[PDB]
Design a protein around this nucleic acid. Structure first.
Ligand SMILES: [Mg+2]
Ligand SMILES: [Mg+2]
Ligand SMILES: [Mg+2]
Ligand SMILES: [Mg+2]
Ligand SMILES: [Mg+2]
Ligand SMILES: [Mg+2]
Ligand SMILES: [Mg+2]
Ligand SMILES: [Mg+2]
Lengths: 55, 117, 56, 151
RNA sequence: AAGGCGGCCCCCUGGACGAAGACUGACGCUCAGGUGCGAAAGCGUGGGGAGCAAACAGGAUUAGAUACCCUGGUAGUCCACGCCGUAAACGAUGUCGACUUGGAGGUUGUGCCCUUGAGGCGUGGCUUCCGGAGCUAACGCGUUAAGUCGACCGCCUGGGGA
């Protein structure tokens, strides 16, 4: 269900500086943590999300 | 001699020293002072107090342009991260924004070996 | 950790915010971690040890 | 003082004015348990200060003491192999004691002919906030404001 | 399988596991010799070379300081194709199979339930921490055994010498 194109949902799982929030804080299942990080990584490459607060 | 009224305080705070640089929005250096060159060496150089007078001495070699607002750019882990910022604000300066810009590699270069002291 | 002071907020409060943003962000910890090379075997060793201590 | 906290002996007041404060002063000036000769020097100095400097003997004392009274100071401390200097905010009772003590010490380290004249001129100087004793307060503050970062 | 494998994307490819039923019909387990794989350093040829850094030089420390610390820095660390065949190559625990009380978790399949909630009841694979009997010199191990048994292999026979 998770898609890198759904930047709205993806935003809930990154920090102010675009860093991925660990499963601990979010309390997200471990299978999907991975799915999320792969979609956040995909979304970063396509410039639909920042890598860093810098830019 | 010229006019700015809108600047940015870049403070480089390493463990051994803390360099303060005042600049415009463009990134052009307006004035600078360091702790190591404000009468502090070795064990005293690397103190928050030395960073403070650095910030103070720097505010005197810049008000030639009459800055009135600025942002702060904190780089590095040493003392004078914070105490430097304070001195600026007391020297007659409105602080607009504070930002840490300490660089973090995404694990690139291999750092030097651990020191076996 | 970027911070922007709001109106009629003292320079101090904004600062305290900033320092807690970095406490939150892990800057100095991060810089400490990278000042010196750590062998892979060593960081695997660190990782087990903290797993272990994280049993009460 | 590892375990046992204590109160403090609450000395009798100055015999002449009935001031506990001046009793803290004569004692501080006292040497070799010569109380009789200590208060003699304190009064003659107060009498010299009182007579020819606008009177108000107790008040004259305070004007001078007001000036050498220190609001903050530093307490040495040894943490991680380092001797840090921590500036501590100091309590009122001792504030008087340091104030009195530096006035007395600056008086003996003086050129004048007797301790009474010295004491008198130290108070006068302190009253105008100048001299050694005031300067002792200022070094305390310069030393304190410097390590303001570690409070 | 072990060595070991971590940004993202594609292509080629190995193994593991689950559900259901069909097929083959003991085709299985183990394995001296044999063959293949096998961290790092090291070797050969040609590339590459930011950072790190054996050697080496310089600055310090020290009674000395061929070190620890500092400023530099070559091989090397990187790529291709060959070589080497070793490590505390470790779980210091060979492989395969059967059997023997429990508790809390992690991970990953799958059947069921007003899916009516981020759940409720089962059933496989792997895994972490405790612990029962039993075992053990003790430490500890304890259904992932170091327990109870069987099949086959490797190895030990006081220290130094080696
Ligand atoms: Mg048949
Ligand atoms: Mg080579
Ligand atoms: Mg070196
Ligand atoms: Mg060579
Ligand atoms: Mg061997
Ligand atoms: Mg156990
Ligand atoms: Mg037992
Ligand atoms: Mg033998």
């Amino acid at each position: 269900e998770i898609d890198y194109k759904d930047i709205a949902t993806l935003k809930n799982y990154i920090t102010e500086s675009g860093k991925i929030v660990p499963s601990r804080i979010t309390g997200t299942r471990a299978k999907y943590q991975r799915q999320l990080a792969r979609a956040i990584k995909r979304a970063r490459y396509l410039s639909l999300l920042p890598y860093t607060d810098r830019h | 001699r010229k006019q700015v009224s809108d600047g940015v305080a870049h403070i480089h705070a390493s463990f051994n020293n803390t360099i303060v640089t005042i600049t415009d929005r463009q990134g052009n250096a307006l004035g600078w002072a360091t702790a190591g060159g404000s009468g502090f060496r070795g064990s005293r150089k690397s103190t928050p107090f030395a960073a403070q007078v650095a910030a103070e001495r720097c505010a005197d070699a810049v008000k030639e342009y009459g800055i009135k607002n600025l942002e702060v750019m904190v780089k590095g882990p040493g003392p004078g991260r914070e105490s430097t910022i304070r001195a600026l604000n007391a020297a007659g300066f409105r602080i607009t924004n504070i930002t840490d810009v300490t660089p973090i590699p995404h694990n690139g270069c291999r750092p030097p070996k651990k020191r076996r002291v | 950790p970027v911070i922007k002071v709001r109106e009629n907020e003292p320079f101090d409060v904004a600062l305290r915010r900033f320092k807690r943003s970095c406490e939150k962000a892990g800057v100095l910890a991060e810089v400490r971690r990278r000042e010196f090379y750590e062998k892979p075997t060593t960081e695997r060793k660190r990782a087990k040890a903290s797993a272990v201590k994280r049993h009460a | 003082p590892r375990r046992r906290v204590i109160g403090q002996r609450k000395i009798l007041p100055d015999p002449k004015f009935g001031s506990e404060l001046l009793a803290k002063f004569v004692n501080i000036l006292m040497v070799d348990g010569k109380k009789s000769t200590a208060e003699s020097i304190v009064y003659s100095a107060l009498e010299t200060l009182a007579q020819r400097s606008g009177k108000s003997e107790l008040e004259a004392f305070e004007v001078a003491l007001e000036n050498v009274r220190p609001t903050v100071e530093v307490k040495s401390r040894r943490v991680g192999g380092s001797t840090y200097q921590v500036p501590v905010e100091v309590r009122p009772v001792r504030r008087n004691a340091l104030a009195m003590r530096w006035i007395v010490e600056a008086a003996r380290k003086r050129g004048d002919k007797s301790m009474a004249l010295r004491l008198a001129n130290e108070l006068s100087d302190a009253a105008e906030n100048k001299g050694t004793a005031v300067k002792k307060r200022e070094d305390v503050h310069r030393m304190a404001e410097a390590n303001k970062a570690f409070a």
